[PDB]
Amino acid sequence: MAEKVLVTGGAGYIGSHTVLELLEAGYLPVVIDNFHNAFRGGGSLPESLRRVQELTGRSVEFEEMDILDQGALQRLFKKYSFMAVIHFAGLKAVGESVQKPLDYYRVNLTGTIQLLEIMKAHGVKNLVFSSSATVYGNPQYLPLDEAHPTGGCTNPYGKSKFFIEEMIRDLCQADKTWNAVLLRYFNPTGAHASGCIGEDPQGIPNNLMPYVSQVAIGRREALNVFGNDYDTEDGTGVRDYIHVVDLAKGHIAALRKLKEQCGCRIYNLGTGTGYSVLQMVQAMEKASGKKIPYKVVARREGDVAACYANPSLAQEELGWTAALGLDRMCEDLWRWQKQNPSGFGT
Amino acid sequence: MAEKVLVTGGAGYIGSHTVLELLEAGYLPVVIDNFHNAFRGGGSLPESLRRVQELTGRSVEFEEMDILDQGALQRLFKKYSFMAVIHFAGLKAVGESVQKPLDYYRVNLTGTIQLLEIMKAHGVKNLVFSSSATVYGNPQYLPLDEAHPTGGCTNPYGKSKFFIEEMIRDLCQADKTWNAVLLRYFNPTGAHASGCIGEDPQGIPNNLMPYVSQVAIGRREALNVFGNDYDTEDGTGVRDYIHVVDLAKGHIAALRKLKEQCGCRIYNLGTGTGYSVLQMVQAMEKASGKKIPYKVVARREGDVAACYANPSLAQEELGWTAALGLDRMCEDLWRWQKQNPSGFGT
Numbered sequence: 082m083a084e085k086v087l088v089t090g091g092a093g094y095i096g097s098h099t100v101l102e103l104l105e106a107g108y109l110p111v112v113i114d115n116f117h118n119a120f121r122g123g124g125s126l127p128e129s130l131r132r133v134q135e136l137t138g139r140s141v142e143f144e145e146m147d148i149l150d151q152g153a154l155q156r157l158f159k160k161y162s163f164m165a166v167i168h169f170a171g172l173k174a175v176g177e178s179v180q181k182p183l184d185y186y187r188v189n190l191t192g193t194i195q196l197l198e199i200m201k202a203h204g205v206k207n208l209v210f211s212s213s214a215t216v217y218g219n220p221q222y223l224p225l226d227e228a229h230p231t232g233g234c235t236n237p238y239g240k241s242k243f244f245i246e247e248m249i250r251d252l253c254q255a256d257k258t259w260n261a262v263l264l265r266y267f268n269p270t271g272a273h274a275s276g277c278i279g280e281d282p283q284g285i286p287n288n289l290m291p292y293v294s295q296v297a298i299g300r301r302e303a304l305n306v307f308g309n310d311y312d313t314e315d316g317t318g319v320r321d322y323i324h325v326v327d328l329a330k331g332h333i334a335a336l337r338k339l340k341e342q343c344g345c346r347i348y349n350l351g352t353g354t355g356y357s358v359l360q361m362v363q364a365m366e367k368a369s370g371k372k373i374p375y376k377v378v379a380r381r382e383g384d385v386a387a388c389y390a391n392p393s394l395a396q397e398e399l400g401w402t403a404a405l406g407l408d409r410m411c412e413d414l415w416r417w418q419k420q421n422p423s424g425f426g427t
Numbered sequence: 428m429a430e431k432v433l434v435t436g437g438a439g440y441i442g443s444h445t446v447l448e449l450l451e452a453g454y455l456p457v458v459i460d461n462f463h464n465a466f467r468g469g470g471s472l473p474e475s476l477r478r479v480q481e482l483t484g485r486s487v488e489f490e491e492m493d494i495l496d497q498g499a500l501q502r503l504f505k506k507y508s509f510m511a512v513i514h515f516a517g518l519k520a521v522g523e524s525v526q527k528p529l530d531y532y533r534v535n536l537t538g539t540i541q542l543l544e545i546m547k548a549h550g551v552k553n554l555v556f557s558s559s560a561t562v563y564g565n566p567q568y569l570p571l572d573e574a575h576p577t578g579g580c581t582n583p584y585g586k587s588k589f590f591i592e593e594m595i596r597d598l599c600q601a602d603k604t605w606n607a608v609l610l611r612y613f614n615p616t617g618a619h620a621s622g623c624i625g626e627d628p629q630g631i632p633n634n635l636m637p638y639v640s641q642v643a644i645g646r647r648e649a650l651n652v653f654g655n656d657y658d659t660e661d662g663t664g665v666r667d668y669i670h671v672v673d674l675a676k677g678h679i680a681a682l683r684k685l686k687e688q689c690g691c692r693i694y695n696l697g698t699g700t701g702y703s704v705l706q707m708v709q710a711m712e713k714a715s716g717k718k719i720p721y722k723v724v725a726r727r728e729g730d731v732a733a734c735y736a737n738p739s740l741a742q743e744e745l746g747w748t749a750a751l752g753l754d755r756m757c758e759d760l761w762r763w764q765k766q767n768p769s770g771f772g773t
């Protein structure tokens with residue numbers, strides 16, 4: 082495989098993991114990031130990628146740049162021969178999307194548009210887009226499948242995701258030579274089994290794990306449980322979490338699919354089983370050996386009882402399955418944290 | 428009124444008419460256009476605006492520029508003091524949106540984003556956005572009102588419109604100091620009573636009138652009527668057409684509303700009565716004095732029986748009403764055409 086794979090936002094959480102899977106699988110990745118939300122390593126790379134090289138014994142090509150920079154993109158594309166692009170570059174803090182909508186739309190939509198245009202200009206018509214199952218909006222049924230209506234999104238982040246999917250679909254509709262796999266998933270968690278890489282501490286987490294996990298290290302007193310009266314097995318809310326490793330590998334599987342001139346395809350990635358808040362607390366206690374006290378507070382406005390995806394189609398068409406469960410997610414997460422209390426540091 | 432009103436895409440069909448109404452009403456407009464879809468006048472202006480000056484005896488400031496050009500926008504904003512912006516700049520040929528989606532998303536979304544950003548940077552937080560009632564998608568009920576669900580759009584044009592509305596809404600949600608009126612309408616038709624300005628002949632018309640009108644001048648044999656079996660008064664399809672003058676004035680009304688620190692408001696503009704294909708043919712015969720032969724062909728895939736808006740809210744909140752009917756639309760259109768067979772010419 083003399084041809085490279087471009088990974089935008091490859092220094093990030095999901096990107097770094099994906100980059101590692103790419104290396105392990107025999108691919109040659111070129112990564113670009115502007116460091117908006119990644120730690121600056123000691124060398125020529127971000128800390129996350131420096132550790133990836135160490136972990137794999139393989140190297141990664143990396144370029145610091147912003148996808149909003151057309152000049153940078155032209156140069157990049159002229160300098161390398163890409164067989165495909167995996168697009169992770171973007172803003173993804175849901176709580177922040179509400180306070181800073183323009184930045185979300187600007188970076189996500191505009192950035193994407195710029196990217197598609199350069200791809201098109203360079204004849205690189207193979208893309209894997211890292212989407213979000215939030216596009217389904219509130220479940221009209223469970224589990225959520227690829228046939229569920231999309232576009233019911235409430236926040237700017239969600240809408241931006243959905244907007245991007247639509248543009249990709251339309252483009253594929255207009256030009257049959259394009260191949261694109263849109264991957265929809267919920268909450269990524271866990272980290273590489275080494276415990277050497279993982280998710281750095283985020284200002285406004287998108288999910289519960291980091292919170293559960295803080296309470297375990299004592300960096301937090303007790304956990305707040307919004308509602309225990311839902312129509313669930315245990316009364317608590319049911320969410321969809323997927324191990325970052327499993328998710329990174331699913332991105333590799335989509336890349337192979339492109340090769341088949343698949344045109345535009347859409348798949349949900351997940352374990353197929355949702356997890357309750359209680360279940361997660363239990364799982365984290367088990368992994369940490371620490372006690373996690375919690376407090377039932379009242380149900381959050383808008384919160385739904387359960388929200389999880391059906392990943393059948395991906396198994397069928399991509400031959401992909403999530404091998405990691407709740408327990409592994411907890412262990413792996415716990416390990417990265419214990420090992421790197423503050424995330425990255427040179 | 429020493430403060431100016433910026434009109435993007437002001438050389439166009441709807442823009443020019445709006446510019447005239449602005450002049451007549453006492454406002455000072457500054458217009459920008461890149462000439463993507465407007466005729467280059469003899470002087471310093473597009474032909475459409477040159478005629479507007481003549482018609483009003485008032486002048487317009489004009490700048491040739493692209494809304495995608497950030498530098499141009501910065502300069503513009505530094506040079507003038509705007510009290511508000513009326514945004515018409517964009518690609519709007521529905522048939523073309525399908526073949527060239529990227530261009531649609533690029534010009535419409537990106538252009539808009541750039542504009543909003545400069546407005547925000549310059550403290551110009553008052554906008555009138557020329558939207559499209561196509562965002563409602565297929566009627567789930569009639570007449571379509573402001574409470575009807577939006578986002579069901581099938582083509583790239585429609586989606587782009589809807590995407591823009593969402594971003595504006597989110598921005599207003601995040602910053603309360605913003606005022607924005609989103610105007611949703613269907614098919615603009617007719618022209619200034621002078622017959623001096625109107626819509627130049629389009630490559631891929633968005634509606635039926637131009638076709639009906641061609642058959643009348645003999646520039647076309649007979650009209651094709653897709654279906655005569657719809658559950659309508661006459662079996663033929665029911666659509667929403669609005670006189671361009673009435674629509675231009677509604678844009679003036681929205682501008683006054685901004686003044687009231689209205690925040691984000693949305694209104695449908697229309698006559699409140701839909702017109703059948705037959706009715707239009709009749710109306711055009713009356714106006715032209717010419718015969719318009721037509722042929723019933725089979726119903727178009729996807730076509731709905733009737734599609735029209737309820738403009739009550741605008742009357743209530745903007746104090747606006749459509750004063751012009753079908754007959755005037757036909758007469759006015761006929762007059763512009765007879766007077767200017769080929770559209771603009773220096």
Ligand SMILES: NC(=O)c1ccc[n+]([C@@H]2O[C@H](COP(=O)([O-])OP(=O)(O)OC[C@H]3O[C@@H](n4cnc5c(N)ncnc54)[C@H](O)[C@@H]3O)[C@@H](O)[C@H]2O)c1
Nearest residue numbers: 090093094095114115116117118119147148169170171173
């Ligand atoms: N974290 C989540 O819960 C989640 C959920 C669903 C989908 N996703 C998608 O995953 C992708 C990113 O994944 P993530 O969760 O690892 O977050 P992340 O922030 O760790 O990584 C995104 C990376 O992109 C970089 N980046 C941001 N803007 C950039 C720009 N303009 N140019 C270049 N690089 C830029 C950031 O610096 C960061 O390294 C996004 O497409 C996001 O929508 C994430």
Ligand SMILES: NC(=O)c1ccc[n+]([C@@H]2O[C@H](COP(=O)([O-])OP(=O)(O)OC[C@H]3O[C@@H](n4cnc5c(N)ncnc54)[C@H](O)[C@@H]3O)[C@@H](O)[C@H]2O)c1
Nearest residue numbers: 436439440441460461462463464465493494515516517519
């Ligand atoms: N024609 C319609 O049926 C219709 C229906 C609904 C809403 N609208 C909205 O009306 C607006 C335009 O109205 P129109 O119907 O008179 O068409 P129009 O083409 O006559 O005018 C649009 C104008 O914008 C200019 N323009 C396009 N891209 C530009 C750019 N990048 N920078 C600067 N100027 C640019 C074009 O040259 C043209 O003068 C759009 O927002 C459109 O979506 C039109």
